[PDB]
Amino acid sequence: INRAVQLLIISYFVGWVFLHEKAYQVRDTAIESSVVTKVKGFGRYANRVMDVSDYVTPPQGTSVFVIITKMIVTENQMQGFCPESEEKYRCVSDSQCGPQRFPGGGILTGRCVNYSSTLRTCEIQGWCPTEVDTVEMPVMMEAENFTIFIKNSIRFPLFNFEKGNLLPNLTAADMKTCRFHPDKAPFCPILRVGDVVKFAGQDFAKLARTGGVLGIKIGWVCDLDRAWDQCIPKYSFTRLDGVSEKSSVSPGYNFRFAKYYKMENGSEYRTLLKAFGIRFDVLVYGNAGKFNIIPTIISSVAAFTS
Amino acid sequence: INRAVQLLIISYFVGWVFLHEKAYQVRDTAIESSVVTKVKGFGRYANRVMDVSDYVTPPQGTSVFVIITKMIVTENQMQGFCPESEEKYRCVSDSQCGPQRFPGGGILTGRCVNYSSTLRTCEIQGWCPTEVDTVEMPVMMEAENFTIFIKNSIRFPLFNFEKGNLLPNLTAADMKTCRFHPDKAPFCPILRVGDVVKFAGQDFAKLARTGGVLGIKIGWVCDLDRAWDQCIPKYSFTRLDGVSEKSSVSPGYNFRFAKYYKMENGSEYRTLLKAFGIRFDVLVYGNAGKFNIIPTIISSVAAFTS
Amino acid sequence: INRAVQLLIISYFVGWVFLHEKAYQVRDTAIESSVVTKVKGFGRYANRVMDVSDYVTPPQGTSVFVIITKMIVTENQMQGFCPESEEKYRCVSDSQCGPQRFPGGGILTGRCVNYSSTLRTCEIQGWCPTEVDTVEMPVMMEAENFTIFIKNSIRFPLFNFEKGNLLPNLTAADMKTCRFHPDKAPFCPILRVGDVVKFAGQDFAKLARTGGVLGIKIGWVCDLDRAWDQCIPKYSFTRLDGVSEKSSVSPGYNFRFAKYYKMENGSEYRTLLKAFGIRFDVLVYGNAGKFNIIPTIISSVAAFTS
Ligand SMILES: Nc1ncnc2c1ncn2[C@@H]1O[C@H](COP(=O)(O)OP(=O)(O)OP(=O)(O)O)[C@@H](O)[C@H]1O
Ligand SMILES: Nc1ncnc2c1ncn2[C@@H]1O[C@H](COP(=O)(O)OP(=O)(O)OP(=O)(O)O)[C@@H](O)[C@H]1O
Ligand SMILES: Nc1ncnc2c1ncn2[C@@H]1O[C@H](COP(=O)(O)OP(=O)(O)OP(=O)(O)O)[C@@H](O)[C@H]1O
Ligand SMILES: *[C@@H]1O[C@H](CO)[C@@H](O[C@@H]2O[C@H](CO)[C@@H](O)[C@H](O)[C@H]2NC(C)=O)[C@H](O)[C@H]1NC(C)=O
Ligand SMILES: *[C@@H]1O[C@H](CO)[C@@H](O[C@@H]2O[C@H](CO)[C@@H](O)[C@H](O)[C@H]2NC(C)=O)[C@H](O)[C@H]1NC(C)=O
Ligand SMILES: *[C@@H]1O[C@H](CO)[C@@H](O[C@@H]2O[C@H](CO)[C@@H](O)[C@H](O)[C@H]2NC(C)=O)[C@H](O)[C@H]1NC(C)=O
Ligand SMILES: *[C@@H]1O[C@H](CO)[C@@H](O[C@@H]2O[C@H](CO)[C@@H](O)[C@H](O)[C@H]2NC(C)=O)[C@H](O)[C@H]1NC(C)=O
Numbered sequence: 001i002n003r004a005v006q007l008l009i010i011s012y013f014v015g016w017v018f019l020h021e022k023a024y025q026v027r028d029t030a031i032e033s034s035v036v037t038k039v040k041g042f043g044r045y046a047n048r049v050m051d052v053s054d055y056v057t058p059p060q061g062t063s064v065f066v067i068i069t070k071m072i073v074t075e076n077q078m079q080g081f082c083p084e085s086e087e088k089y090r091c092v093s094d095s096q097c098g099p100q101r102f103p104g105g106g107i108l109t110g111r112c113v114n115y116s117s118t119l120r121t122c123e124i125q126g127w128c129p130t131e132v133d134t135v136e137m138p139v140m141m142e143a144e145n146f147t148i149f150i151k152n153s154i155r156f157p158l159f160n161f162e163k164g165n166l167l168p169n170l171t172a173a174d175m176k177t178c179r180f181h182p183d184k185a186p187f188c189p190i191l192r193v194g195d196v197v198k199f200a201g202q203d204f205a206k207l208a209r210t211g212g213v214l215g216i217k218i219g220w221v222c223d224l225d226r227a228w229d230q231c232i233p234k235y236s237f238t239r240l241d242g243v244s245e246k247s248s249v250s251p252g253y254n255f256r257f258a259k260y261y262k263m264e265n266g267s268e269y270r271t272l273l274k275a276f277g278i279r280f281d282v283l284v285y286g287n288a289g290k291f292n293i294i295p296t297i298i299s300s301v302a303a304f305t306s
Numbered sequence: 307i308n309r310a311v312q313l314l315i316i317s318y319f320v321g322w323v324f325l326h327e328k329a330y331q332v333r334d335t336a337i338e339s340s341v342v343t344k345v346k347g348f349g350r351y352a353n354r355v356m357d358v359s360d361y362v363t364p365p366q367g368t369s370v371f372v373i374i375t376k377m378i379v380t381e382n383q384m385q386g387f388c389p390e391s392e393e394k395y396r397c398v399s400d401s402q403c404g405p406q407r408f409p410g411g412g413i414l415t416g417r418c419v420n421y422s423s424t425l426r427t428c429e430i431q432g433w434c435p436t437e438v439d440t441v442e443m444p445v446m447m448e449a450e451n452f453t454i455f456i457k458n459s460i461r462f463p464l465f466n467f468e469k470g471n472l473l474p475n476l477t478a479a480d481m482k483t484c485r486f487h488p489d490k491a492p493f494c495p496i497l498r499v500g501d502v503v504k505f506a507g508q509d510f511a512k513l514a515r516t517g518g519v520l521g522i523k524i525g526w527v528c529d530l531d532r533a534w535d536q537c538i539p540k541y542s543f544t545r546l547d548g549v550s551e552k553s554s555v556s557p558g559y560n561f562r563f564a565k566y567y568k569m570e571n572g573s574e575y576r577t578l579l580k581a582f583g584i585r586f587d588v589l590v591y592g593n594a595g596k597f598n599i600i601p602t603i604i605s606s607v608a609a610f611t612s
Numbered sequence: 613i614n615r616a617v618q619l620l621i622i623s624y625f626v627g628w629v630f631l632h633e634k635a636y637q638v639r640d641t642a643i644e645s646s647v648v649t650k651v652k653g654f655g656r657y658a659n660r661v662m663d664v665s666d667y668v669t670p671p672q673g674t675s676v677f678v679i680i681t682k683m684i685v686t687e688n689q690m691q692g693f694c695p696e697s698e699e700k701y702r703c704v705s706d707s708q709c710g711p712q713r714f715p716g717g718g719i720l721t722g723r724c725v726n727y728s729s730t731l732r733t734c735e736i737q738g739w740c741p742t743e744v745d746t747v748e749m750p751v752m753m754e755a756e757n758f759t760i761f762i763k764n765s766i767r768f769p770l771f772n773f774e775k776g777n778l779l780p781n782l783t784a785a786d787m788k789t790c791r792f793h794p795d796k797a798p799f800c801p802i803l804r805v806g807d808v809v810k811f812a813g814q815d816f817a818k819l820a821r822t823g824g825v826l827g828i829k830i831g832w833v834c835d836l837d838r839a840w841d842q843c844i845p846k847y848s849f850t851r852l853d854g855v856s857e858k859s860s861v862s863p864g865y866n867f868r869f870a871k872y873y874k875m876e877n878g879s880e881y882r883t884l885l886k887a888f889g890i891r892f893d894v895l896v897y898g899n900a901g902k903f904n905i906i907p908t909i910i911s912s913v914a915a916f917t918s
């Protein structure tokens with residue numbers, strides 16, 4: 001019957017396509033973005049204090065940056081023939097010392113030598129002090145702090161539009177003692193690591209003890225057709241590895257690096273750091289709509305079809 | 307009236323959809339890209355000369371790489387109880403020295419000690435020589451130079467297509483003394499930093515003195531349906547942070563890193579570098595069109611609807 | 613004739629749009645991904661042995677990481693006035709020594725001095741031992757090994773869906789001696805570098821001797837409408853620079869970095885490493901489909917038009 005058809009013709013276009021879907025909908029997916037991240041704060045580890053240039057492994061301050069929370073340090077690693085402390089590689093003869101396994105110290109030379117007094121392991125060639133990743137080192141519990149400053153600037157090239165999250169209404173006096181809280185200061189770009197993990201929804205102790213990646217997505221669903229001040233950034237913080245993390249193997253994200261030094265000598269040595277950190281990832285996504293000319297007649301024709 | 311309808315039926319399809327819009331329009335957004343960037347040149351700073359392995363902080367040579375233009379260097383930073391040179395933290399008693407503020411040197415121990423002769427500041431624990439970011443250090447004015455070599459290779463998997471910006475027509479003799487200028491050599495992949503900032507549209511002195519990110523987009527709007535040599539890369543250089551830069555706080559992009567050394571001793575020390583640089587970002591985007599079979603009948607049906 | 617039209621109405625919708633194209637097709641392009649890469653293995657170079665913290669230049673273990681295969685090492689590089697070993701810069705007088713060329717050692721001072729006994733080259737200012745990139749250093753032929761562990765976790769936010777490539781069915785005992793082979797273990801996330809280059813389709817010797825980038829794409833074409841275990845990752849390994857590589861200039865991807873040390877002195881020195889490596893790139897792409905409500909009536913209307 002055409003009686004219901006007459007109503008349903010406008011119940012879908014005007015109700016949803018026009019008023020809700022913004023029937024014009026001139027989009028621009030290609031948004032060019034720039035993110036600058038700066039970590040600030042001071043932490044205590046073992047018996048010393050470290051700053052931004054210490055727990056932040058990548059100094060670029062790009063959208064990807066690791067905040068180290070747990071360290072395993074091995075100092076004065078010189079090269080030579082050395083045994084290992086891995087109890088999973090017990091040998092009593094050289095026969096079970098040839099190349100058939102996956103050593104963690106170095107290439108086996110087919111020699112089972114004593115380690116300290118009675119522990120016999122295959123002799124390896126490489127850095128002598130083998131790292132011990134079976135000791136629960138104290139976590140940098142001061143890592144609820146160290147604020148993060150995120151400067152984001154985006155451009156829509158087709159619309160020529162340009163906007164940054166550092167609006168002129170914010171001064172240095174405000175930024176001196178500014179936090180992030182999306183009920184009273186949605187706009188302040190000074191995040192807190194503890195606040196970030198709280199918004200993610202996990203306790204900070206476990207994440208700092210095991211490591212992970214927390215993605216901070218800045219969505220810009222703007223309304224350029226309306227006033228330009230209505231395009232408001234939206235911050236969403238979500239764990240990324242935690243989906244595949246649960247309780248299976250590889251219970252976190254950890255990496256290994258080293259610092260290389262040299263005596264007044266002909267030989268070098270490195271200090272090895274195995275770091276469990278919280279690698280922050282910054283992602284920028286969004287779109288803008290404009291009234292334009294072309295989609296109006298297209299939508300009119302589409303309504304004519306109905 | 308059908309008289310105007312007959313004309314308007316083909317005025318929109320043949321005029322725009324067919325001839326201009328390439329009605330077939332078989333697209334492939336998923337283009338796999340590889341960018342290799344190599345900076346070359348030698349610069350003078352203070353009283354010494356540095357090369358590519360010095361001002362280019364990330365040695366990967368990926369699409370993201372910082373060209374350092376200004377340095378603030380603090381040498382022989384040993385750990386201990388030290389004061390700070392920040393005049394914004396004046397104290398006359400220990401009462402205003404407990405933890406309630408945002409120190410830039412280290413964790414305050416609640417002790418206000420003299421700095422040099424009469425300047426009293428809260429005693430901090432950490433690296434002793436505090437950095438001074440209030441001195442206008444000379445800018446590396448030689449940074450108009452240091453050419454950049456960009457090797458870009460892309461593949462369209464659905465179309466199997468493959469192309470790189472290093473065409474076989476270019477030899478080493480040409481690349482020896484080749485610049486970039488999109489009127490006589492659009493194709494030479496040897497950019498100049500001064501040329502890049504000039505095409506961006508800002509004076510190099512201000513950018514090198516404050517820092518920023520300059521995105522270089524390589525657009526490949528190819529015409530695979532036609533001859534394969536007509537797919538020509540287009541280079542567009544645009545500032546990214548400059549949108550949110552203007553004259554507000556945080557007037558540039560700067561980072562901090564350090565180099566760690568160790569004496570014939572039991573103690574370590576680091577040299578801290580606060581760098582204001584021009585971080586070049588390389589982005590690859592584009593699409594390809596093919597005649598194919600499917601869209602032809604779809605467009606024919608769409609024309610039949612009109 | 614309507615006789616063939618009646619058949620062709622359903623020959624295109626039911627045959628292709630409905631059964632094959634999954635007419636509902638509720639997509640989600642915005643998939644949030646996290647990739648953690650860990651290289652393991654030990655290699656022999658010159659007369660020493662190196663581990664993960666040595667040939668893997670970026671210790672972040674992100675989607676982009678270089679596996680160094682060939683090194684050119686210059687040790688004890690101190691600053692001063694030094695000549696160069698580049699035979700392409702022969703001079704017999706100071707007149708052809710002013711600034712008009714592209715030096716590889718440093719800024720020319722307009723002085724042509726002897727190099728060793730009879731070779732005269734322009735005197736440069738900078739690091740004294742100039743690197744020699746014209747000697748075929750032995751390739752790390754042990755680079756067929758050093759397995760790679762890739763942990764990938766993805767989330768579809770609109771569908772709330774969440775999945776990682778480290779499924780609970782895999783334990784540590786399996787991962788201890790697990791390889792990657794897409795006929796018997798498609799699911800094991802332990803790739804082999806030799807296996808990766810074999811699947812790419814090039815001999816490993818040439819790639820390790822010249823360098824390149826090998827992209828590993830993990831496609832997730834899931835069927836969330838069906839059981840969630842049917843969404844199976846697909847690994848595709850493809851060379852990226854090899855398209856623009858062929859036999860033209862710049863026959864590979866190489867970079868330069870250095871390690872900085874300091875004596876018990878007032879001067880510093882660096883050891884320079886020119887590295888030809890295989891930079892692995894990890895890309896994540898995919899989409900998911902859901903039955904939903906909206907597209908059903910849209911497809912019904914589209915069929916009504918026919
Ligand atoms: N390339 C690889 N080849 C084989 N096993 C690997 C590889 N990378 C990681 N693994 C294994 O994955 C598991 C997770 O290790 P993870 O990276 O979380 O750190 P870990 O348990 O401290 O071990 P590791 O000492 O091996 O670094 C371990 O059982 C480890 O042996
Ligand atoms: N994590 C942070 N917490 C608080 N304030 C911050 C943070 N990061 C940056 N700021 C502030 O942002 C402003 C811009 O500083 P910027 O990074 O441009 O370098 P700067 O002015 O030399 O300062 P700084 O010595 O703090 O590095 C400063 O007022 C600084 O205090
Ligand atoms: N910024 C640049 N300006 C000029 N020529 C460059 C630049 N970058 C690379 N080239 C040239 O590109 C070619 C490829 O060099 P490539 O990077 O593959 O290493 P190479 O041949 O060992 O040379 P190099 O000693 O210059 O690093 C060389 O002829 C080199 O001179
Ligand atoms: C991290 O910073 C917070 C504040 O930003 C510290 O927490 C406060 O410390 C003061 C110290 O006197 C207490 O009075 C407050 O009750 C604490 N909580 C709050 C909400 O203010 C905290 O000590 C810092 N360090 C760590 C490890 O959390
Ligand atoms: C400067 O302008 C900005 C943008 O409007 C203000 O920031 C937000 O403004 C909205 C107004 O719709 C308020 O609801 C928010 O509470 C504001 N957030 C923050 C963090 O301020 C900002 O308040 C303005 N500054 C002023 C008025 O001093
Ligand atoms: C950067 O390189 C340019 C050339 O590539 C140098 O500029 C020229 O220097 C010569 C020196 O005799 C002058 O004769 C020219 O007039 C200069 N300009 C041009 C356009 O050739 C420049 O000196 C280098 N350094 C800096 C800091 O710009
Ligand atoms: C090698 O072929 C390339 C691709 O055509 C040439 O590069 C451009 O060719 C177009 C022809 O349409 C010219 O208009 C441009 O001026 C060329 N640019 C450059 C930088 O050369 C290139 O010229 C060819 N090399 C030759 C003929 O020696």
Ligand SMILES: *[C@@H]1O[C@H](CO)[C@@H](O[C@@H]2O[C@H](CO)[C@@H](O)[C@H](O)[C@H]2NC(C)=O)[C@H](O)[C@H]1NC(C)=O
Nearest residue numbers: 098099100752753754755756757758791804806
């Ligand atoms: C890389 O590892 C492979 C095995 O993963 C080594 O190849 C085997 O070495 C044993 C040594 O006794 C031989 O018996 C086998 O025939 C070799 N091949 C295979 C397929 O097992 C190889 O030696 C290692 N190193 C290099 C440089 O390839």
Ligand SMILES: *[C@@H]1O[C@H](CO)[C@@H](O[C@@H]2O[C@H](CO)[C@@H](O)[C@H](O)[C@H]2NC(C)=O)[C@H](O)[C@H]1NC(C)=O
Nearest residue numbers: 779780781782795796797798799800801841842
């Ligand atoms: C655990 O479940 C996974 C997911 O099904 C199994 O992995 C694959 O399962 C498919 C079943 O369709 C097999 O065809 C593949 O051969 C399996 N691949 C691998 C590497 O195992 C896995 O087998 C299961 N583990 C068990 C049953 O122990």
Ligand SMILES: *[C@@H]1O[C@H](CO)[C@@H](O)[C@H](O)[C@H]1NC(C)=O
Nearest residue numbers: 078263264265266267268570
């Ligand atoms: C380094 O110094 C030690 C003594 O501290 C010495 O035994 C060793 O031989 C030196 N290394 C080299 C390469 O000479």
Ligand SMILES: *[C@@H]1O[C@H](CO)[C@@H](O)[C@H](O)[C@H]1NC(C)=O
Nearest residue numbers: 384569570571572573574876
């Ligand atoms: C480092 O050397 C200095 C003397 O130059 C000495 O005072 C200091 O105690 C040494 N550090 C350690 C940890 O022994």
Ligand SMILES: *[C@@H]1O[C@H](CO)[C@@H](O)[C@H](O)[C@H]1NC(C)=O
Nearest residue numbers: 264690875876877878879880
């Ligand atoms: C470094 O030590 C050498 C001797 O090994 C000396 O000639 C030189 O002057 C020292 N450098 C400085 C800056 O004193």
Ligand SMILES: [Mg+2]
Nearest residue numbers: 104132133134
């Ligand atoms: Mg382990």
Ligand SMILES: [Mg+2]
Nearest residue numbers: 410438439440
């Ligand atoms: Mg400051």
Ligand SMILES: [Mg+2]
Nearest residue numbers: 716744745746
């Ligand atoms: Mg060369």
